[PDB]
Amino acid sequence: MRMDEFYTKVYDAVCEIPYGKVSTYGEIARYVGMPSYARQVGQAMKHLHPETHVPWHRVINSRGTISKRDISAGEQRQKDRLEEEGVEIYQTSLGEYKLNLPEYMWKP
DNA sequence: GCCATGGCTAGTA
């Protein structure tokens, strides 16, 4: 599987995530037949341009939290976009953004 | 080739 093939599948997958729903790097990776490529699912998200209609904001980590990144703006934007989607997000002490994963999780 | 990065994760304290 070429990297370009992967990136495209990941993107196709993410677009399938329903409004106001959420999925996981690892889940998407598995979903596209690449269980060990969870980190690369991150990369795919990061690579996207700001205009993209791909719901990159609907992908968090396995702990149901929003991942911290080099570009802190995204971390913030993801929280905001999700909240607009009507997604209850509380803030852990030692400010990490968290949510009830079992509820919002997307299951095809 | 080595090395550091980086939106990860399960297992292990």
Next chain:
DNA sequence: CTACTAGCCATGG
């Protein structure tokens, strides 16, 4: 619950 580590793997200097 928080912290950390081992396994993980593309990317690019």
